[PDB]
Design a protein around this nucleic acid. Structure first.
Ligand SMILES: [Mg+2]
Ligand SMILES: [Mg+2]
Ligand SMILES: [Mg+2]
Ligand SMILES: [Mg+2]
Ligand SMILES: [Mg+2]
Ligand SMILES: [Mg+2]
Ligand SMILES: [Mg+2]
Ligand SMILES: [Mg+2]
Ligand SMILES: [Mg+2]
Lengths: 293, 170, 56, 205, 159, 50
RNA sequence: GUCUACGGCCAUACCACCCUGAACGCGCCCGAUCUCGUCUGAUCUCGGAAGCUAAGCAGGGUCGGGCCUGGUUAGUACUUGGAUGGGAGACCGCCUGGGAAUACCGGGUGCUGUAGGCUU
RNA sequence: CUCAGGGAGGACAGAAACCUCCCGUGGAGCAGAAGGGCAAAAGCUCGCUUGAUCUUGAUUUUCAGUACGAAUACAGACCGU
RNA sequence: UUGGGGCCGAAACGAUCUCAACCUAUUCUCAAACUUUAAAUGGGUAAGAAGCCCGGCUCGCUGGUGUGGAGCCGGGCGUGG
């Protein structure tokens, strides 16, 4: 035959990687540079905005790391958006912007910094960076943790960043990976960015599919017509969502209720059960031979 | 009743012509795949120089293309129309994948242009299941498991069932 | 005319005649070799410690 | 042709094997290490006798071959050519060096390779003969004749193991009959209770 | 004679342990070193910048200067008649908090607590570490069985 | 006399042959009397000996 | 009881095969007008929600391999210091202290930090 | 993005040209001698570049604790990405 | 899984011995320039008043935050650990 690679000597010398690397979730090469602090800063917290886009949700957190594991100081999710007004399309660019705005205003409400550093209330899509007013507490500085998302032009990890820096946080960035940047001429057009902030690219697709074929329209947008979301009112829907987010961004936890404490999985088998099972198997195997021989 | 997430589909169809020289032969052979598929193919170069075959290191040798979607179905049907819907037992691999080779590309149905001439090529069919993107997506890459794998015996049954072909022993 | 190349035979006995003494431990070691930015700011703090004397 | 064995007798230098640094070593004088009826099963040669070194010295490959030839040629005459198995359990891996005096004297006096010896400890088995229980005194006499080809002092010890194995002869037959040992040609395989049960079913079926 | 190379004879000294290669963990990055901390030095071959010399591997010193990625350590060095106080700039991966002073600090806080205690009660509690004394006189109960008689075993030539 | 042993024989104040001294016993003392073991003859004195 | 985002120590966590997954989630999945990128919307990016736990994932199993931790090996091998000990030597014994590692035989098969869910 | 190598397949194609699937803890590669180190990299391929620039001091290595060479932490600038 | 000799097959991954390369569990013997393990002896630090402890002040350094760090003063603890 051919020599088997995964022999006993293969597993004796095998060094596993880290658990998060084995699950694939964490780039430790980027983590070593995103997280650690200069040693002459002496346990000053180094914050980061984690933006993670799942299939049906957008998660925005802000974390700083100690020895025991990093501490989440504020978290904003995209499934909280039906409270604020938008119910359909919780995983697009406009929902990423609303999640970043939630995270920014919710952190400023925790630190008591709502009135100072309002941010860009009337959105334009331009390069906005908050400036620390002297005689006041300084602006919150954090850095984007894009993770393993490929940071090309038009990413929702940068939409959440635009939402945060319009909410009032100081995240250093350039306006190159925002949509509207023309790589042919190296110039950023802010009006195209404002369309993606207000979700007008989805509005054009709904109008396009409505004029092409109503069957493809109902296939692609089933919850839009179920919840009565039309391309003309999405603009004011996202404006009212922004207004409701900046009006009250404080998160109230859902009340935990008492549970009957049922076990859904299987408990681990004990030693005596494992010793008896193999004895029953051997006793069955000898009996099946003396009964068939 | 079988789980419809386990439906055995065609993932991709890989085509190449291995010419072995450089020059206008490669351009004509690439034009064959370009007018056959509708997409431009890509040139494949040599790994290292062997002096008995006339090839050199980093010299362009072959022309290959990959076809996915509903176009691969009709290109594969044009191939098995030439092959009379028969294959051998040795044309199926251990991983559930199968290919064959065709000697005159005109038999596809493509028209003869006197400047290009006659080339043969070979087709390879990469079957798949819904869920095979796990092994090559970037974020959380994982294995495919054992029950979800395609085998030689199950790929032969798929070919005999859907294309109504026959497997002659050899 | 070959001679001896190298040895350390009597050296450990020579070292212990006057003793192998640790360096002179003093309080207030020198700030020479400390990084210039923090050393520059410490001088500014020492320069203005006399400012809040009447409040102290 | 070569120097007497009293020169390269004691284990003075560090071990100096044939490797990518020490090249040009001539071939070892002993190449056949076990011989006789080496294609024999375990249960037919139960008696094992060892020649055991009592000293820490070097044994040359020429002496190893000269001893095993004498042991073979006595045991063939005594018990037949197919009634024994002799195994030399010492391989010559140390390389001794020769500094030829053609007149530079001791300038740059590092030796070129001369031959191969085996570094032998106290209590280490030199050769082992397995045969039936009736050929005990023939094994003792054959090893006593082979002691004269070696420097120093050796002892003769009839082992308590079953042949060329590591299991005791009083319990070997019971441990085979309980299927804890399986014959595997010259030696046996020990079957523990630690594998999957599908091998236990194949064992007991 | 030998060479004067910087990393001569560091083949096993600067090598990683078995099945402990690869990505360096981040807890040795996100821990805090201040001036006066007692630090032992252990060279790691994964990172090559800021490596201590081989004569400081296994030594212990005290931090005097802290930078962005490195700390400065005063290490005692035995040189040929005498001991010098060396000032070396070592990057943070080669650096570990020593636990030798930790037991002394836990004893200092225990001694201060035990001195605040028993001042209002008027008694006297031992604060010095006494060495291991001779054991006190005790009774050994041979309850039931007599002690087992041990004898030397005869020789067996198992060689 | 070895240097480590000379230092312990001076810390026991035994600088001359047939000198005697009283030493209280603990682990730190037994591990020094083990170092100076071939050069001394020590034991447990009687009350009349004291 | 358990999951998700981000982690700490990095196999008690890995590898092979099998079984089961309620709810939320994570996913597979459906598409390419817009952002973006390819020979190929397979990957990446984007817009979704018809179907499905099949796979990934979680839990569990295997007289499982590995790994971790013990016993045996064994006070053995080795070793600090000592003798006007033995031996022709090679080397060995004793006094004084310290003390390993295979084969072989048992047990175990991730703990946990912050934030947010489901089990109302 | 993943290498060395291997297995099973595919016209000419064979030991060895090219395509595809699977296994692959590094068995490859990192200019050279060897050793150490390294896998979403320090390897391979691309895009942009000149931190191979100017300027003080301090430190380590050889060491007399002197130089040269080489090296490590900073600080002041101007930059690249 | 290919071969070195075949042989009954004109022949077929057929009969069917075989010997070597290969594969799989075992086994004998080794390494100054091998190593999963791994001593004895040894090499560094610590075993306090230059330490703990509170309060206040300064900073152009560092920061969401009279945050963090460092330097200054003013006291209190002597069973001298
Ligand atoms: Mg990155
Ligand atoms: Mg001289
Ligand atoms: Mg010598
Ligand atoms: Mg798709
Ligand atoms: Mg699943
Ligand atoms: Mg299932
Ligand atoms: Mg097991
Ligand atoms: Mg948890
Ligand atoms: Mg990279």
């Amino acid at each position: 035959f051919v020599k088997v690679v995964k022999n006993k000597a293969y597993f004796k010398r095998y060094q596993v990687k880290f658990r998060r690397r084995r699950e694939g979730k964490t780039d430790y090469y980027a983590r070593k540079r995103l997280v650690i602090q200069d040693k002459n800063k002496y346990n000053t917290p180094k914050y980061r905005m984690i933006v993670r886009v799942t299939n049906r949700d957008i998660i925005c957190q802000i974390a700083y790391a100690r020895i025991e594991g990093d501490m989440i100081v504020c978290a904003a999710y995209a499934h909280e958006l039906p409270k604020y007004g938008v119910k359909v399309g919780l995983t697009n660019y406009a929902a990423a912007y609303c999640t970043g705005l939630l995270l920014a205003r919710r952190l400023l409400n925790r630190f008591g910094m709502d009135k100072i550093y309002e941010g860009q209330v009337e959105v334009t899509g331009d390069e906005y960076n908050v400036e620390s007013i002297d005689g006041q507490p300084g602006a919150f500085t954090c850095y984007l943790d894009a993770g393993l998302a490929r940071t090309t032009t038009g990413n929702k990890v940068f939409g959440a960043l635009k939402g945060a820096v319009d909410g009032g946080l100081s995240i250093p960035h350039s306006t190159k990976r925002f949509p509207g940047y023309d790589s042919e001429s190296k110039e950023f057009n802010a009006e195209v960015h404002r369309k993606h902030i207000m979700g007008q690219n989805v509005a054009d697709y709904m109008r396009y599919l409505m004029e092409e074929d109503e069957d493809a329209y109902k296939k692609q947008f089933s919850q839009y017509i179920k919840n009565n979301v039309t391309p003309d009112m999405m603009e004011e829907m996202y404006k009212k969502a922004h207004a409701a987010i900046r009006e009250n961004p404080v998160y109230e936890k859902k009340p935990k209720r008492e549970v009957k404490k049922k076990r859904w999985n299987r408990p681990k088998m004990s030693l005596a059960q494992k010793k008896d099972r193999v004895a029953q198997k051997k006793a069955s195997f000898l009996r099946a031979q003396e009964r068939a021989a | 009743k079988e789980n419809p997430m386990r439906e055995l589909r065609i993932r991709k169809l890989c085509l190449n012509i291995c010419v072995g020289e450089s020059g206008d032969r490669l351009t004509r052979a690439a034009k064959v795949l370009e007018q056959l598929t509708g997409q431009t193919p890509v040139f494949s170069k040599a790994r290292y120089t062997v002096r008995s075959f006339g090839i050199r290191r980093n010299e362009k040798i072959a022309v290959h293309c990959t076809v996915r979607g509903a176009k691969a179905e009709e290109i594969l049907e044009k191939g098995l129309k030439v092959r009379e819907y028969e294959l051998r037992k040795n044309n199926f691999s251990d991983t559930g994948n199968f290919g064959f080779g065709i000697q005159e590309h005109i038999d596809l149905g493509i028209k003869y242009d006197p400047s290009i001439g006659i080339y043969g090529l070979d087709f390879y069919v990469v079957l798949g299941r819904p869920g095979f993107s796990i092994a090559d997506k970037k974020r959380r890459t994982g294995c495919i498991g054992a029950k979800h794998r395609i085998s030689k015996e199950e790929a032969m049954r798929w070919f005999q069932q859907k294309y109504d072909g026959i497997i002659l022993p050899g | 005319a070959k001679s001896k190349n190298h040895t350390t035979h009597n050296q450990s006995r020579k070292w212990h005649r006057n003793g192998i003494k640790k360096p002179r431990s003093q309080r207030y070691e020198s700030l020479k070799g400390v990084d210039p930015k923090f050393l520059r700011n410490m001088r500014f703090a020492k320069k203005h410690n006399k400012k809040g004397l009447k409040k102290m | 042709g070569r120097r007497p064995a009293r020169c390269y007798r004691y284990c003075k230098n560090k071990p100096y094997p044939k490797s990518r640094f020490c090249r040009g070593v001539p071939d070892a004088k002993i190449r056949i290490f076990d011989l006789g009826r080496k294609k024999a099963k375990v249960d037919e040669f139960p008696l094992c006798g060892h020649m055991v070194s009592d000293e820490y010295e070097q044994l040359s490959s020429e002496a190893l071959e000269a001893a095993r030839i004498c042991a073979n040629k006595y045991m063939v005459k005594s018990c037949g050519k197919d009634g024994f198995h002799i195994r030399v359990r010492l391989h010559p891996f140390h390389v001794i060096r020769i500094n030829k005096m053609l007149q530079t004297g001791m300038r740059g006096a590092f030796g070129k390779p001369q031959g191969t010896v085996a570094r032998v400890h106290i209590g280490q088995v030199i050769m082992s003969i397995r045969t039936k229980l009736q050929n005990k005194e023939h094994v003792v006499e054959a090893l006593r004749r082979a002691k004269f080809k070696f420097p120093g002092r050796q002892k003769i010890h009839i082992s308590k193991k079953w042949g060329f194995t590591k299991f005791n002869a009083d319990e070997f037959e019971d441990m085979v009959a309980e299927k804890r040992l399986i014959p595997d040609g010259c030696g046996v395989k020990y079957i523990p209770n630690r594998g999957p049960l599908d091998k236990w079913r194949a064992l007991h079926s | 004679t030998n060479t004067k190379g910087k990393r001569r004879g560091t083949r096993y000294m600067f090598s990683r342990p078995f099945r402990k290669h690869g990505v360096v963990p981040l807890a040795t990055y996100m821990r805090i070193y201040k001036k006066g901390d007692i630090v032992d030095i252990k060279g790691m071959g994964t990172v090559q910048k800021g490596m201590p010399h081989k004569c400081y591997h296994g030594k212990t010193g005290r931090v005097y200067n802290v930078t962005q990625h490195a700390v400065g350590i005063v290490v005692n060095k035995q040189v040929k008649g005498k001991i010098l106080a060396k000032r070396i700039n070592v990057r943070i991966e080669h650096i570990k908090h020593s636990k030798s002073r930790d037991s002394f600090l836990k004893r200092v806080k225990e001694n201060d607590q035990k001195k605040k205690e028993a001042k209002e009660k008027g008694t006297w509690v031992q604060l010095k570490r006494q060495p291991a004394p001779p054991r006190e006189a005790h009774f050994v109960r041979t309850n039931g069985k007599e002690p087992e008689l041990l004898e030397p075993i005869p020789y067996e030539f198992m060689a | 006399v070895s240097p480590k042993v000379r230092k312990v024989l001076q810390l026991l104040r035994l600088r001359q042959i047939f000198n005697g001294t009283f030493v209280k016993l603990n682990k730190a003392s037994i591990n020094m009397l083990r170092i100076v073991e071939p050069y001394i003859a020590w034991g447990y004195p009687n009350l009349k000996s004291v």
